[PDB]
Design a protein around this nucleic acid. Structure first.
Lengths: 138, 36, 7, 433
RNA sequence: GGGGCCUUAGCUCAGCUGGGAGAGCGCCUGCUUUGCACGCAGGAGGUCAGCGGUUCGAUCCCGCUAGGCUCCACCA
RNA sequence: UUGGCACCUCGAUGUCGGCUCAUCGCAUCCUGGGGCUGUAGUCGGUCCCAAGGGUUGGGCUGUUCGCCCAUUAAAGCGGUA
RNA sequence: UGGGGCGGUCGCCUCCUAAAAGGUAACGGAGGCGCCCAAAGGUUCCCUCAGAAUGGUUGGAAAUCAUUCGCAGAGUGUAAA
């Protein structure tokens, strides 16, 4: 379960998610990965769920590279209060994921094991996913 | 069983499309699935 | 309140 | 140990040693031990009033009871009420184990009011209670008791004293050369217990010493021994010594003719209680280990023997389940024969007639193959039992041999040998590090 | 709805911020005690309310459970 | 349902619970027809099709709700200021 | 004042929100000020900071001293640019 232990500011603007991925577009650590097709906030609970779902089915094999990190906090005002009167308290941490970005990286297993592990990870994520692999021109 | 995720459970399952509805028939009657 | 007590 | 006679000798010695005097300091370093710093004639004295559940005693100690921790509230009230005063007299309430301390203590406002401090040494019912000697209400007690728990003689601050119960005896000293025998009424030989429950404040040790001083116990070869020992107690003719037979120690104010082994002659009771004992600790360790360890080893040996007998029962159940497998294999083709017991079902020809002899239970049942299959499963469990119970019998005889050896090594030896036995055991096995 | 700390021996309950579950009370075993139910040692209980993650070991770290007791919810 | 906003009404839109009269939607309580059951039969569990009809008399509390007594084939959820 | 109350705030300075001139709101997000200094003011003349390593006796990770690598990782009274 992933969170920064110290931040410069505890309350930040929610930002915008226009455009493609700025970086982390190509798979370059593992052999196979998930490429994002839509943009939404990914909570660290979802990241933990996808990581356990991959790691359990890969009980024998290589390690998992988590390419995204939930650095941006989101604030949640308490329920049943009026609008305004100050910004609410921070509740959790999300990672801003753009389309084209690689989320998790797997090497050291077979093809179908990696495909099924990425499918089990993708069924926990709130975004449309696809299977990508390393290209060697090169 | 009626579910919107009609999938072949075993190797003997066969996917058919009766009446515009995706269905799975099998020798095992527990694998009979319909949607819609 | 809104008591209907018109006289 | 401990007793009204030893209490009388202690009162005589305290009247000889600390008469008048001044209580400069009151310390309570432990939960049951109270130290009085008596400044009597000559040098300073250190009176100890102990109310331990097993080691309760009153004597003038000489060693330094260190660790003066933060004092409890009974010690603080003792320093508030008793310190600065004088001791009038130390007397015993009859022949029971009750110590009365008369404290001529000046009050904190300046005037004088005599205080009576009561020390009771009854083993696990020992207590120290201070009264104001005019109304005899309890100012404070060392152990606080409720109206429910120990309903008689409730010890609360401000409650009236109730005084320990009457044992319904006669005073053993200066009684009569005839009163002593006109009430014990020896019939079948409970002599020491009759002395215990017919005399005031007498230990079973003094009764067992008196029945040895009588020699052959008779009608007259017993009261002259009791009067002789009471004359030895009176006129203050005590000979304090420590005697023991094996490890565990005994002390008394009179020389012991029974239960020999050691002499360790002493001068007074103060050095006697200083040397024995401190208070437990090694004696209480060999008390807590000695009988409990051998009891544990003997009980575990009985467990292992019962285990071996019940494992041999399963070894006979092995042959019973082999007969069950034979009867199931008889049933399996069956019902060749009628369902009942399916006995001797075999095909005359084109059959391998095992035709084993069988004992015929009625043959079950609703599910005709699963009964024979259940029999065959019981047989597989039986052969796995043939392996495991023989392993358990081997382990149980190894445990019984080791526990019989431990019984032998506990039933006396060395001291240093027991020390290195402990060493070897702890080595045997690693064992967090 | 918002916040706190626990839920561990038949009971009361420790355990220092991860280094291997304990004290008191209850129940037995043995010793000892002349005698007034006054003493000593030795045994069992716990999946640390429960569930899966982390690391070499988790009451301790984490989420969600399930509870208790906390301390309040200004209105028509 | 509890909320959020304050768009309509402050030259008046009467607000809870009951009584009387009802009507509508099934995300169906029973009755009707089925599939799978770790459905031997009765009784069951889950998921379909189905609103045609019927879905109670009390004790407590202003109470809806809730608890209990006795039945029933069942004593169904909601909308209509 | 996302009704009023209760709570909070009321003047000045710095950053973001502020959309590459300026300006720009919300009970939006972060902080400070109601001073201090006869010098920390003026002029003239010189010099360049913090950290790492090596070596040092009381010096150990750090008191003080030499060396390199140091365009500033220092300092600039007080706080942000």
């Amino acid at each position: 379960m992933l969170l920064p232990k110290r931040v410069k500011y505890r309350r930040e603007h929610r930002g915008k998610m226009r455009g493609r991925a700025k970086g982390g577009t190509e798979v370059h650590f593992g052999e196979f990965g998930i490429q994002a097709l839509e943009a939404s906030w990914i909570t660290n609970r979802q990241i933990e769920a996808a990581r356990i779902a991959m790691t359990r089915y890969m009980k024998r094999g290589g390690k998992v590279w988590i390419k995204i990190f939930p650095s941006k906090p989101y604030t949640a005002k308490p329920l049943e209060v009026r609008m305004g009167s100050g910004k609410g308290a921070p509740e959790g941490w999300v990672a801003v994921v753009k389309p084209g970005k690689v989320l998790f990286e797997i090497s050291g297993v077979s093809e179908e094991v990696a495909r099924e592990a990425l499918r089990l990870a993708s069924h926990k994520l709130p975004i449309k996913t696809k299977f990508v692999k390393r290209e060697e021109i090169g | 069983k009626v579910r919107p995720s009609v999938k072949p459970i075993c190797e003997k399952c066969k996917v058919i499309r009766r009446k515009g509805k995706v269905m799975v028939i099998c020798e095992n009657p527990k694998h009979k699935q319909k949607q819609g | 309140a809104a008591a209907a007590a018109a006289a | 140990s401990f007793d009204g006679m030893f209490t009388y000798g202690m009162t005589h010695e305290l009247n000889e040693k600390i008469m008048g005097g001044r209580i400069t300091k009151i310390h309570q370093p432990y939960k049951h031990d109270v130290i009085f710093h008596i400044r009597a004639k000559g040098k300073n004295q250190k009176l100890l009033l102990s109310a331990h559940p097993s080691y309760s005693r009153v004597h003038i100690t000489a060693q330094a009871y260190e660790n003066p921790s933060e004092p409890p509230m009974f010690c603080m009230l003792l320093r508030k009420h008793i310190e600065g005063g004088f001791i009038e007299k130390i007397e015993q309430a009859g022949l029971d184990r009750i110590m009365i301390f008369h404290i001529k203590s000046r009050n904190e406002i300046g005037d004088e009011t005599v205080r009576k401090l009561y020390v009771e040494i009854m083993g696990r019912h020992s207590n120290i209670i201070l009264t104001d000697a005019a109304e005899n209400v309890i100012i404070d007690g060392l152990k606080h008791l409720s109206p429910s728990m120990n309903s008689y003689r409730t010890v609360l601050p401000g409650q009236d004293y109730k005084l320990p119960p009457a044992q319904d005896k006669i005073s053993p000293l200066e009684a009569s050369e005839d009163d002593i025998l006109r009430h014990l009424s020896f019939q079948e030989g409970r002599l020491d217990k009759q002395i215990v429950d017919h005399f005031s404040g007498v230990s079973p040790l003094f009764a067992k010493e008196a029945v040895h001083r009588a020699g052959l116990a008779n009608k007259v070869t017993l009261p002259k021994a009791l009067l002789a020992l009471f004359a030895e107690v009176k006129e203050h003719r005590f000979i304090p010594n420590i005697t023991t037979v094996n490890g565990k120690e005994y002390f008394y104010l009179l020389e012991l003719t029974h239960l020999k082994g050691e002499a360790r002659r002493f001068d007074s009771l103060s050095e006697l209680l200083d040397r024995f004992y401190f208070g437990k600790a090694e004696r209480d360790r060999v008390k807590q280990q000695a009988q409990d360890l051998e009891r544990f080893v003997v009980n575990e040996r009985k467990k292992n023997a019962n285990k071996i007998k019940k494992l041999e029962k399963t070894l006979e159940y092995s042959e019973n389940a082999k007969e069950f497998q034979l009867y199931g294999e008889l049933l399996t083709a069956n019902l060749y024969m009628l369902k009942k017991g399916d006995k001797q079902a075999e095909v005359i020809n084109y059959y391998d007639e095992e035709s084993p002899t069988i004992t015929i239970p009625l043959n079950p049942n609703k599910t005709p193959s699963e009964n024979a299959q259940a029999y065959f499963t019981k047989y597989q469990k039986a052969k796995n039992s043939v392996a495991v119970v023989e392993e358990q019998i081997r382990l149980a005889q190894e445990e019984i041999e080791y526990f019989d050896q431990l019984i032998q090594q506990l039933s006396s030896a060395s001291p240093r040998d027991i020390s290195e036995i402990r060493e070897e055991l702890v080595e045997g096995k690693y064992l967090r590090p």
